[PDB]
Amino acid sequence: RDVQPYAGLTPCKTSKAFAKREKTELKALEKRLKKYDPESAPALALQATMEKTKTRFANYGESGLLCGKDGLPHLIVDGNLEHLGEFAIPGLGFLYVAGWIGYAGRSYIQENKTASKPTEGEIIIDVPKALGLMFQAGAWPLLAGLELKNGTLTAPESEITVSPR
Amino acid sequence: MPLSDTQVFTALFVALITGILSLRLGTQLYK
Amino acid sequence: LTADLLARTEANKSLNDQKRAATSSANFERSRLVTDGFCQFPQNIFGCQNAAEKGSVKFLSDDMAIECEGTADGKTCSSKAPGAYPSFLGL
Amino acid sequence: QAALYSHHQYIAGFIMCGAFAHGAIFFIRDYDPEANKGNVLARMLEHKEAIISHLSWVSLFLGFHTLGLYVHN
Amino acid sequence: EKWGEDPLHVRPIAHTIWDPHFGQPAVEAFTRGGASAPVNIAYSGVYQWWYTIGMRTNVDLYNGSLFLLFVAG
Amino acid sequence: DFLVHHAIALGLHTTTLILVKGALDARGSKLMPDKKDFGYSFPCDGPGRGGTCDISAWDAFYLAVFWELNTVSWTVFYFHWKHLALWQGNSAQFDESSTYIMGWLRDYLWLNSSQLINGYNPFGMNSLSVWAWMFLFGHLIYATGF
Amino acid sequence: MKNFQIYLSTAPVLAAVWFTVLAGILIELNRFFPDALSFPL
Amino acid sequence: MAASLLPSIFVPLVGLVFPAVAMASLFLYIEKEQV
Amino acid sequence: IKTVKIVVDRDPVPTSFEKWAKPGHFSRTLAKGPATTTWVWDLHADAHDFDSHTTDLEDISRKVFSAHFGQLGVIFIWLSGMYFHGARFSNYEAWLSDPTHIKPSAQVVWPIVGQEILNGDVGGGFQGVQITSGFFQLWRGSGITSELQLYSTAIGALICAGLMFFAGWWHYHKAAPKLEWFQNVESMMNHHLAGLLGLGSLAWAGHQIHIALPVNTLLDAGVDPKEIPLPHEFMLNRALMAELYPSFAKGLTPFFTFNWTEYSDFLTFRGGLNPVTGGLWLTDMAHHHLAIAVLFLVAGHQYRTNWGIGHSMKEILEAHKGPFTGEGHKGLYEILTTSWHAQLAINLALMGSLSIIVSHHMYSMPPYPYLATDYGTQLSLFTHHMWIGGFCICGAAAHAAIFMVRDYDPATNYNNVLDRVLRHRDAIISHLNWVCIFLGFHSFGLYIHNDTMSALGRPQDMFSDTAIQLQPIFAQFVQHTHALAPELTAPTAAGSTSASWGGDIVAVGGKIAMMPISLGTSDFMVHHIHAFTIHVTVLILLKGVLFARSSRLIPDKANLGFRFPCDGPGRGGTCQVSAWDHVFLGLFWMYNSISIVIFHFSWKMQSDVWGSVTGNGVSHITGGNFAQSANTINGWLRDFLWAQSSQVIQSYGSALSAYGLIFLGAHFIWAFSLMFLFSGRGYWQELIESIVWAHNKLKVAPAIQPRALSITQGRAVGVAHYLLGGIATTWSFFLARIIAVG
């Protein structure tokens, strides 16, 4: 895709410095290659590395990246629609995954707190129940919203131990 | 133009008086 | 002995250089057989060394082929024995 | 220019450390909970755990992500 | 004064060095500016500050030093 | 500049964490409820209760001074490198090498320490020998502090 | 047997297995979808 | 004349003489018994 | 006089996973369960503290024996891995043909995240991580010419590892020996001298003679490894072996008639280095191992076991007493036959000293073909074995202190050689501390004065070679006597032990295998520094051991334990009083000293030994700047740290980029250790209280209560990360530098 220049950053696809970066790396690869005869396995490995570099640079060109004066891609994280894949979408993926991990943990700690000996189950994890809670934590945002609305997400002030101050 | 010797020594004597006054203040503080 | 051994080093030097290049290429390629697509999931179900030994590998098998090529007659080859029980778990 | 910038930044950092130290000293020697009952200061004592925990959170987030981006680069 | 004449091509002087431990290379290498003795190059900006506030000659600086001596007393 | 300002923010937030923790737990905490009866600066409350080393608010200050020195050093390293790049006329050096730590270690610290460490050497000395001696002097004091 | 399974369910062994598997999946994703600076769109 | 004389006198005065007297004096006071 | 015999309890413990399912079974406080997060660290800390688990010494001895079996199984796994990698993941066969120009490499990385760049151009049509363990040189010196031989011994090593584990299981669960079995030290020495060292050295001498010697002779002559006859064709075919070395045409007749001079062609005393490979003469090494075997076989018949001939070590201890030492060595036999920690202290001390000697003797007398020429492996081996030695010595101090606190009984040590040491520990420690101060003042002012004089522009007042001659006259004398040893005091030696003494610089393929080492004023200063740092480490460790039970500050310290944080802020403050804390500081200084030893080694070798002869004199790596720059701290900072860091810091974009990343990472870990070191538990516990409040707010409060690390554990973590970061920084620096410069 063709992205508009933003914050004084030209698109990497049409950036001469991006082409120079690609060129330089590829030439370095060639130099590394030259000492190896083509039949030997390092020669093929280096040619595959060159291919990988070319397709990486091409993919970065097409992915609507903005490059700077240095010639390397720069991320726009202000929320711009043209660069949402830089931070927003992977940000949403992280927020979903991290909240899943945390909610699986919270659910297991609350469930194990009802056991006869909670601290032993804290180190010897009940794998079937654990996995059940882990897969139930797929709908973490919903269940967290329910806990927030019902007031059971947060313990009241009086129950929590505090310093004498 | 460098400073005259009389200028340096006058300032140094003023400094000596200032130092005496600093000693008076230090003694008064120590009480 | 050393005289004739040096003489046949001189007479076989190119073949042994090819052998050393092939075994080194095999040893290096042994880290890239899936990336390059030689011992993929079907063929490497058992040992991919066994694949090179028995079946076909771009570099590993090559070595397996030339490793005992053009060696001294009467003596078992320096690179491999005449026989051996299979490598432990194709490892 | 470099010497003056370094000078004033190091002096500022030390003075800041002193300001916070003297406030801790105020809380020990000079703070009266009975007289300051109900004002913002006693309220600070009341939700100190929240303040410290959120300071720990922001510090942990900043350090994890800044160090990670630096190590990645 | 000389610094005021050529601010961009004269290194400011802080104070003369009288170190008994200096060797002859040290005495010959620390003599910067137009000094005839080993000196330290004033990196505190006092020259630019005093030039900006209108002080031009050593007499003005001496008068100021004497006045601040009187103020300190 | 993004990454270094976030490093600065880390330093300020952590130093403030340590100092605010010292101030608010100065009068007592769960480990030592009666901390206000021991004054501002005391060594500890013994090895009992698991250990109470560096429990006083004075000790919180002592710990926060390290983070303060670290943060201020980060800020002035940023200042000095950015300005050195500006003053040589090649700002691209900082803009290229400030995104990764090896760039700071190589193109700023190692690169600009060449003339400093050559203040004195077996081939005589120059006007930077005093600053070389002070550099090594400060290294000595830092280690003795350790 | 069952006790050994319980031993496996211990925190260290389970952490090692879980992070071994996780590193494996992440490595496989970086092999089949390599060099991903940003989510494409 | 001040420039050729005063440094060579006052640098030892402030860096050898005054330190010696000050340290000796402070020692005598600090070790001085309360009575 | 108990009879030495085999004693066993049959099936003492059943083989079952019930204890695996229950963490902390070995203890009583840890068995009940985790109340707080301290329990995890306690579990791991006393995992191998067998004395604190069971009171009886029999069970402890069985646990130690089977744990040793498990360690040996682990070592055999590691060896199997190294040989297997040298077979399927290396260029050993290519390196065999061109050892001077092909870089050894036995590790290849998978091409996943761009890490394939670490597969450097090591030569031979191969790519991988260049290795510095010297394994290729070892295999070449052992006569390995094919990857099948490496594979075969790797599989053997894996089988042996399985056998070692099976032996540990057998000797804990099936055939655990009784306590009276382990206490047969006479028999132990008889076997571990005659049978472990004696027969082991004999076996290796036989290998060297029959396998390594002919194969390496053919390699020296220029024969292709793929054309060399196989080792069994030399060991069995006597005509083939006699063709290379004509003494084998006489069989064993000269051996059994004391006509051993006929074996002089393959059992030599040449001394020096092989000019082709740059390693010790293999005939010399074979003769060496033969004589070592004989000496140990004879020395292993010293002690009486079951027949009246021999010595009783108790008697020879007790008979050594004198006017200054009271009862002498009486009671030490009881110490060292009823305390594992005492034996562990002695054995660790000697192992550490030995590893140090091993490093010295291997750089100076390279025992492997094409080892000296490969500067990277030589530096790596030296530095490695130095660090191992210093660590083992610190552990020796620790276990000495552990014995002193736990297993020392005043009743059985009344007026013996140990009790009198405990009765004038004040004199010992004060004299050592005085020595330590003296040494530091003199040596550091030797550097600081030089820094000051150079900065003041007074090179004539420096302690350099030109200005003030502090010549190491005694070391130069020793060098002279050793260079002249083959003429007067070692007449049958054809050459000196090392070329480092003097004359006839050894070069292989341009690069210098070995060069005579000079000793100027910088060598004097750095050696006195070494002595200073050693003496301070010894001060710390010996003070910890001697004051392990009591002091004028804390008299009742024995019952506080070997490992306690303090006795309180009273008495002015009693922090770090335990002998464990002395090992902490002792460990720190050990690290510091090694850091100077290996820096001296690296700079001196790069400047005055390593290099390349081009027919116009030596072209050293750094150009011989050590002698004139290593007399100043600025010189080490600039010409060694700053100058030689260019390889590691500019390593990005090459195969050494991993070394650069580790350099930074180890810097980080060292600074991260400073957190644990400069802080204390109370702060961290209060921060945990705030964080626990935050968790309790959201009902995420763990059942196991979060706790700050114990003060001992905090110090432990601090020293561990400090040692890790410092050593790994030096590792990355040394390896990147020496690999890039070559």
Ligand code: CLA
């Ligand atoms: C390669 C990518 C990468 C990696 C390795 C990490 C790694 C980490 N992140 Mg980061 N992060 C990333 C990308 C990444 N992050 C991106 C792209 C974003 C933008 C969305 C974030 C935003 C982010 C935040 C905001 C936080 C982290 C935190 C953390 C740490 C714990 C995360 C976790 O799941 O714990 C397991 C998860 C839990 C125990 C549950 C805790 C709550 C989680 C973190 C969020 C759920 C709350 C909810 C959505 C509301 C969010 C409010 C927020 C917007 C302020 C860990 C060091 C946390 C941290 O260390 O701070 C102290 C943290 O607070 N990350």
Ligand code: CLA
């Ligand atoms: C206007 C500023 C100001 C004022 C009035 C005070 C006043 C006070 N402070 Mg505060 N403080 C300040 C700034 C200030 N401080 C700053 C900036 C810091 C941060 C560094 C501190 C940190 C601090 C702490 C942590 C504590 C105090 C305490 C005190 C009290 C006693 C000081 C003392 O113990 O004796 C005088 C102090 C000394 C003699 C020690 C000075 C030692 C210095 C650091 C040596 C420096 C070496 C030198 C620079 C090296 C030379 C160069 C080298 C090349 C040779 C007093 C009320 C103490 C107290 O009991 O409070 C009630 C206390 O616990 N303050």
Ligand code: CLA
């Ligand atoms: C480079 C050195 C270093 C580093 C990394 C830290 C890091 C930290 N300190 Mg410490 N500290 C140090 C030096 C250092 N300190 C020194 C010398 C002092 C003076 C005594 C202090 C004093 C100090 C105090 C007094 C306090 C801190 C706090 C903190 C935290 C600040 C929050 C943050 O940045 O989170 C980000 C965290 C990090 C960068 C830590 C490393 C995390 C790594 C990157 C993750 C590793 C994952 C990887 C898989 C590991 C492999 C290991 C494998 C073998 C197991 C953090 C844990 C504060 C705190 O607890 O806030 C909550 C606090 O109160 N520190």
Ligand code: CLA
């Ligand atoms: C000829 C006799 C002989 C030999 C070779 C050894 C060799 C060894 N003993 Mg000793 N030992 C002997 C007699 C012998 N022992 C006697 C008579 C006793 C009773 C008084 C002991 C009591 C004893 C104790 C208490 C311990 C040892 C340990 C060790 C090992 C130390 C590790 C080492 O150096 O690795 C060298 C490594 C090798 C040589 C590799 C091969 C390893 C195998 C085990 C060598 C086989 C030795 C064995 C005696 C012969 C097989 C007999 C078996 C079939 C019954 C070493 C393998 C320690 C150890 O590590 O425990 C396992 C240990 O804790 N030994």
Ligand code: CLA
């Ligand atoms: C441990 C080290 C070691 C080993 C194993 C050997 C081994 C050998 N050496 Mg060497 N050697 C060594 C050290 C060693 N050497 C040292 C240190 C020196 C320097 C002095 C020499 C110098 C030397 C010379 C100069 C010569 C040898 C030779 C030999 C071979 C002759 C063996 C022989 O017939 O003697 C007699 C051996 C025996 C009687 C033992 C055989 C007993 C068998 C195994 C009994 C098995 C019976 C079983 C119970 C039942 C049978 C059936 C069953 C298999 C199914 C043999 C391969 C000779 C040779 O040919 O080399 C090429 C030779 O000329 N050696």
Ligand code: CLA
């Ligand atoms: C022959 C060697 C030997 C043997 C048999 C022992 C055996 C023992 N030691 Mg001794 N010790 C040794 C060497 C040895 N040590 C050395 C070389 C040192 C110097 C460092 C010490 C210092 C020492 C101290 C200071 C103490 C002991 C203690 C102990 C006992 C308990 C150990 C335990 O359970 O901890 C299990 C092991 C650990 C908890 C260590 C974990 C790993 C650490 C952090 C290092 C890992 C570094 C690693 C290589 C780097 C990479 C990490 C990577 C994953 C990132 C046990 C009797 C303790 C005791 O109570 O004695 C009775 C004790 O306090 N030892």
Ligand code: CLA
């Ligand atoms: C560079 C930092 C540094 C320095 C200088 C010292 C210095 C010292 N340590 Mg410390 N130490 C340090 C870091 C340092 N340590 C660190 C980080 C650790 C880890 C925790 C330790 C751990 C430690 C322990 C555990 C022990 C020491 C001991 C010693 C002493 C050893 C004797 C010696 O060096 O001779 C004398 C001192 C020096 C040479 C120091 C430098 C002084 C120079 C030469 C200047 C000379 C005088 C000069 C001209 C000034 C006069 C004029 C002035 C007034 C203006 C000495 C006081 C040991 C000890 O005290 O017993 C002897 C001891 O047991 N230290």
Ligand code: CLA
């Ligand atoms: C301990 C280390 C050390 C040593 C050996 C030296 C040595 C020297 N310095 Mg250097 N210096 C050092 C540290 C050291 N310095 C440090 C750390 C600094 C601070 C930066 C300096 C700064 C410095 C300066 C600035 C100068 C020197 C100078 C000198 C020289 C003359 C000093 C003098 O007059 O001594 C006087 C000495 C004594 C009064 C007594 C010495 C001790 C006696 C001999 C001990 C004998 C005890 C005996 C064995 C006991 C017997 C007992 C028996 C009766 C029973 C001399 C070469 C001067 C120079 O230029 O000369 C080259 C000079 O200008 N030094």
Ligand SMILES: CC1=C(/C=C/C(C)=C/C=C/C(C)=C/C=C/C=C(C)/C=C/C=C(C)/C=C/C2=C(C)CCCC2(C)C)C(C)(C)CCC1
């Ligand atoms: C944007 C801008 C603006 C605005 C600004 C502002 C508004 C700012 C602010 C700023 C601020 C707002 C700052 C702050 C700071 C703070 C601080 C720095 C603090 C500190 C604290 C402390 C130090 C404490 C102490 C204490 C304690 C500790 C306790 C007791 C008490 C006391 C207080 C003593 C304007 C438009 C105007 C202009 C432009 C720019």
Ligand code: SF4
């Ligand atoms: S450890 Fe913490 S508590 Fe125990 S003495 Fe040292 S400082 Fe006081």
